PDB file of C-alpha atoms in Angstrom:
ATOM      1  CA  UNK H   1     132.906 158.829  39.850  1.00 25.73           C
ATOM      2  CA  UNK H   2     132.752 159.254  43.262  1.00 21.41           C
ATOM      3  CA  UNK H   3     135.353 157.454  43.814  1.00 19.95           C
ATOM      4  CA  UNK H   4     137.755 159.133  41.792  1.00 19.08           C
ATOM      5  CA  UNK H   5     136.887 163.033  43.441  1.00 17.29           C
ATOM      6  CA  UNK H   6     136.560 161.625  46.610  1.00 19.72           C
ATOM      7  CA  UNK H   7     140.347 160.765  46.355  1.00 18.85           C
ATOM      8  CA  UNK H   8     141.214 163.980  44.637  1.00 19.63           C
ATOM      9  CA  UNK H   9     139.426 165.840  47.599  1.00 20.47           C
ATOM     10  CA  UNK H  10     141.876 163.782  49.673  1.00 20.42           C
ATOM     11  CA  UNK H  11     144.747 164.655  47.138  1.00 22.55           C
ATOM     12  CA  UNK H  12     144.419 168.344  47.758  1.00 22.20           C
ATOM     13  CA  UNK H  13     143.944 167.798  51.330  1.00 22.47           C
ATOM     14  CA  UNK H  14     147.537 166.780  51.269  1.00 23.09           C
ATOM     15  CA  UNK H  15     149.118 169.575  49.409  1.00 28.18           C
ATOM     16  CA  UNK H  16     147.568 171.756  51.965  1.00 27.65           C
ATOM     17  CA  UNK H  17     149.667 169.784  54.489  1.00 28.43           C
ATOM     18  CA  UNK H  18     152.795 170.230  52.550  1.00 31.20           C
ATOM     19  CA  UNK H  19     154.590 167.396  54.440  1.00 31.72           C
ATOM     20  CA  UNK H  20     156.848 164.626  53.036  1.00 29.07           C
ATOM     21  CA  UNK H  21     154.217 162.066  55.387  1.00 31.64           C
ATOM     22  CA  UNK H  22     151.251 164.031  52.954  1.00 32.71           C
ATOM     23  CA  UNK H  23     153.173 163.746  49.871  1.00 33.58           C
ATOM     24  CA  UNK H  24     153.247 160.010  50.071  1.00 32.34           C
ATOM     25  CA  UNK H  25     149.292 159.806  50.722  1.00 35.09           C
ATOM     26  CA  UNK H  26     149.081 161.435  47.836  1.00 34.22           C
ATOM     27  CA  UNK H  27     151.011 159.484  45.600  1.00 35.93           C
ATOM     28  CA  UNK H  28     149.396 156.292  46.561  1.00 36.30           C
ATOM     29  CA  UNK H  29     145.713 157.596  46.111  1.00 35.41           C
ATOM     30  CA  UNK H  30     146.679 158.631  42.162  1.00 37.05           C
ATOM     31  CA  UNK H  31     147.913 154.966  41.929  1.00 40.13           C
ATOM     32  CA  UNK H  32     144.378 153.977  43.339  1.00 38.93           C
ATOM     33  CA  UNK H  33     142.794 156.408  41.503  1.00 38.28           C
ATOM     34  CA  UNK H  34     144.088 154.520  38.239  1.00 37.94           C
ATOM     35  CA  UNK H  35     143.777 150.989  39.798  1.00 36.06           C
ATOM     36  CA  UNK H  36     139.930 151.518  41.122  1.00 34.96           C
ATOM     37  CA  UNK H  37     139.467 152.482  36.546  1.00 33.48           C
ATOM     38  CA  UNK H  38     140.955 149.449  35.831  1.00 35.93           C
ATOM     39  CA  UNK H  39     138.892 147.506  38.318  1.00 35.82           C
ATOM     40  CA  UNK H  40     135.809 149.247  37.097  1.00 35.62           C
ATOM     41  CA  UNK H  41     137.055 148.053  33.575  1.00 38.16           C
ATOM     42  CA  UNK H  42     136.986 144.242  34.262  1.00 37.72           C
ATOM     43  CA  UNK H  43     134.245 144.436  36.741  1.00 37.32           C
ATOM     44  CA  UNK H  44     136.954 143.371  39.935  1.00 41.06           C
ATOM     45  CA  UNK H  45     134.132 143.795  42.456  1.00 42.69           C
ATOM     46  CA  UNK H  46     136.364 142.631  45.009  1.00 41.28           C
ATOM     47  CA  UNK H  47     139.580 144.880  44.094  1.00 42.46           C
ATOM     48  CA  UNK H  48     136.914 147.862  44.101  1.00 41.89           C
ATOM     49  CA  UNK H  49     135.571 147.093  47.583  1.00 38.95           C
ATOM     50  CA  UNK H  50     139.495 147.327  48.784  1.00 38.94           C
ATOM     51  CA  UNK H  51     140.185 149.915  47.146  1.00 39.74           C
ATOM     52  CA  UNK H  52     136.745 151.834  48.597  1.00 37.31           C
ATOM     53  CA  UNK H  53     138.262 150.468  52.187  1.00 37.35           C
ATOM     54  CA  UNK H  54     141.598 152.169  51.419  1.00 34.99           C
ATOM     55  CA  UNK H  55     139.665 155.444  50.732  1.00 38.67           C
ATOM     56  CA  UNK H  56     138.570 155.363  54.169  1.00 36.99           C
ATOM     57  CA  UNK H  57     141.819 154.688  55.645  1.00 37.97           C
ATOM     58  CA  UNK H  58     143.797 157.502  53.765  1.00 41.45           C
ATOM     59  CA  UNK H  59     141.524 159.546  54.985  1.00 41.96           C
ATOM     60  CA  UNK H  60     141.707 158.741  58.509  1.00 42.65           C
ATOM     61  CA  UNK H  61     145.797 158.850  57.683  1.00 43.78           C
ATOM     62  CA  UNK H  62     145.452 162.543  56.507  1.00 43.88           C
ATOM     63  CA  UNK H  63     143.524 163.173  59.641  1.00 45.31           C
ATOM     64  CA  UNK H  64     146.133 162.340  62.045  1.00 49.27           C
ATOM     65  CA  UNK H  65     148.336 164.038  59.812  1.00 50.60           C
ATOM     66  CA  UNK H  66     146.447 167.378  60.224  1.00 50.33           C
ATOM     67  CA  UNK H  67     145.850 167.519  63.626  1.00 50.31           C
ATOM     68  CA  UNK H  68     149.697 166.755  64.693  1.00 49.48           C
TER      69      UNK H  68
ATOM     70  CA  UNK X   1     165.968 146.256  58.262  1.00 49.92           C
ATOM     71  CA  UNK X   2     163.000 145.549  59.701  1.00 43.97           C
ATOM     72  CA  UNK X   3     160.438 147.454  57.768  1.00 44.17           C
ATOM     73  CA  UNK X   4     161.858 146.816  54.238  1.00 43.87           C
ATOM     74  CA  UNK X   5     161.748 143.012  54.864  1.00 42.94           C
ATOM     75  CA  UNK X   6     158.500 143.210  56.156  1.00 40.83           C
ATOM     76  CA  UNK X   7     157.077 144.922  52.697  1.00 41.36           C
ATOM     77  CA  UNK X   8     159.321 142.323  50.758  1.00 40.02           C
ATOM     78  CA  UNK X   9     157.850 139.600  52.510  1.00 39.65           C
ATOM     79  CA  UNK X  10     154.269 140.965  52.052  1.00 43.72           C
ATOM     80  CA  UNK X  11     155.276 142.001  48.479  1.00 43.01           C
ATOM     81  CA  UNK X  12     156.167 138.248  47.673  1.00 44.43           C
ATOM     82  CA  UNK X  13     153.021 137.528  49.448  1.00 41.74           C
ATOM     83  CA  UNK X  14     151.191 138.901  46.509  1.00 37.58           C
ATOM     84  CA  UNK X  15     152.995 138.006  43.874  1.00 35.78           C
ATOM     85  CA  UNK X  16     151.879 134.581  43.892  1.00 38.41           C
ATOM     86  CA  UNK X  17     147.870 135.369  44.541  1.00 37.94           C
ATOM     87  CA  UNK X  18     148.237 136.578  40.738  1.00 34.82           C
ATOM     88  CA  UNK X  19     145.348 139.189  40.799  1.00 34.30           C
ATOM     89  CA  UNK X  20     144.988 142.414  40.000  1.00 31.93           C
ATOM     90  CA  UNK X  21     144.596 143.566  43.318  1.00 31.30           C
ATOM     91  CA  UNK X  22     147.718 142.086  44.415  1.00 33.56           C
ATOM     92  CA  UNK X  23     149.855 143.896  41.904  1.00 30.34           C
ATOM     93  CA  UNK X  24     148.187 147.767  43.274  1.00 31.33           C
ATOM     94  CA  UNK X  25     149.340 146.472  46.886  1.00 29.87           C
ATOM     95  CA  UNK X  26     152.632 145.109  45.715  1.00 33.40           C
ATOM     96  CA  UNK X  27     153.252 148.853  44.102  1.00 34.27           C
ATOM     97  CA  UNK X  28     152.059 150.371  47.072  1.00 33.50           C
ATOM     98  CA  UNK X  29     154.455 148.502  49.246  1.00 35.30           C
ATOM     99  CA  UNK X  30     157.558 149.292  46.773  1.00 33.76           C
ATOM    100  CA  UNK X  31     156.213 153.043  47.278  1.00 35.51           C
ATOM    101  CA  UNK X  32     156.457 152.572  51.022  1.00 36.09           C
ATOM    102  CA  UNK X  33     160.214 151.105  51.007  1.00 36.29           C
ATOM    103  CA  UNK X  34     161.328 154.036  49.094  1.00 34.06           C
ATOM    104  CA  UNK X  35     159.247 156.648  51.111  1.00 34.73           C
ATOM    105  CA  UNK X  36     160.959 154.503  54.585  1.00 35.80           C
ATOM    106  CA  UNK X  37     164.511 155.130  53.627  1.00 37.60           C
ATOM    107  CA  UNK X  38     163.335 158.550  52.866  1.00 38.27           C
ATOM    108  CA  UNK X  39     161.870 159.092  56.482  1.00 41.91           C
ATOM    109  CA  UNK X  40     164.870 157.533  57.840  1.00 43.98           C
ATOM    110  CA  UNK X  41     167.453 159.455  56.329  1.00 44.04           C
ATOM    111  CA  UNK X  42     165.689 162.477  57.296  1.00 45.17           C
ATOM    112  CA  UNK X  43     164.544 161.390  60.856  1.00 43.61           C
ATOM    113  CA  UNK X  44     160.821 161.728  60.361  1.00 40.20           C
ATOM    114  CA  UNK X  45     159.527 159.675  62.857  1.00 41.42           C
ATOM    115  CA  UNK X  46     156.192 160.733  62.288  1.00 39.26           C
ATOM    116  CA  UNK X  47     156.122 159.517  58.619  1.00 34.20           C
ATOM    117  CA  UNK X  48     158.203 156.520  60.075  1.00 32.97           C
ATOM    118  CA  UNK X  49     155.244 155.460  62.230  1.00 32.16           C
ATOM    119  CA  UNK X  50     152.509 155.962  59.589  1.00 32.24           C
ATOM    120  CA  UNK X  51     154.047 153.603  57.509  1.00 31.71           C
ATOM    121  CA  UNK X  52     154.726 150.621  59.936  1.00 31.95           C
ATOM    122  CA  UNK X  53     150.763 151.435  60.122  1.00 37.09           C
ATOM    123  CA  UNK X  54     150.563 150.877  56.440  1.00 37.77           C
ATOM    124  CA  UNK X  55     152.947 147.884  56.498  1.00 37.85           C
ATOM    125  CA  UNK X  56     150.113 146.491  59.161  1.00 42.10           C
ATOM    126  CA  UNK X  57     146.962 147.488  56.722  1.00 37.88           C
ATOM    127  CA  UNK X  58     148.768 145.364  53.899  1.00 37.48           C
ATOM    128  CA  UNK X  59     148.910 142.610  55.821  1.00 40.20           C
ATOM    129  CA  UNK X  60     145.105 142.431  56.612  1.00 37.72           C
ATOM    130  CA  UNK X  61     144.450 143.590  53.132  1.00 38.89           C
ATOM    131  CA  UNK X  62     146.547 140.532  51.743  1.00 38.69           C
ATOM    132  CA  UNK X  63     145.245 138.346  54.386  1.00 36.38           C
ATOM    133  CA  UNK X  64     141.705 139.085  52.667  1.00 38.12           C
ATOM    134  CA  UNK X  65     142.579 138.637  49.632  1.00 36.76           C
ATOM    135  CA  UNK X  66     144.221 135.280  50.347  1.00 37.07           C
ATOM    136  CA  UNK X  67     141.661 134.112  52.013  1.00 39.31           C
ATOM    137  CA  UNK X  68     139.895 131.243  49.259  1.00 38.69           C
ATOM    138  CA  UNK X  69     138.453 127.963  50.012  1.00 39.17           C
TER     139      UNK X  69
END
């Protein structure tokens, strides 16, 4: 899925930061990574669409992170 | 402390939407308690203020999720 690599490309995005902000990014998209399969398992439209939205905001998160 | 009692507030928030989605954000809060007392025994403000962000994206997130006529 594209969901999935799209959070590991964010995952290894924060190794490379090697911070103990980055760190906890990173343990919070493996937790989505597992929640966004279970949500694809029951067909939780809604708990994908957050989960899509929280993407998005790590993202931004690891942004900040890299710049400062 | 303000930010822990914040994320147990939000975290009994979710406990009784009794959803799936509730029980990823109530993990990711308990992550963010432990990862706060972390930050503030080592003085990282930086990691401080990203997660009174977080704290602030729960909210909303929960706030969707409650939100059921």
């Amino acid at each position: 899925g594209e969901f999935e690599k799209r959070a590991k490309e964010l995952i290894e995005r924060a190794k490379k930061l090697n911070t103990p902000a980055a760190k906890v990014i990173e343990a919070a998209l493996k937790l989505f990574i597992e929640a966004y399969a279970e949500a694809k398992k029951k067909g939780d439209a809604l708990q994908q669409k957050l989960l899509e939205e929280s993407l998005k905001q790590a993202e931004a998160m690891l942004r900040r992170l890299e710049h400062h």
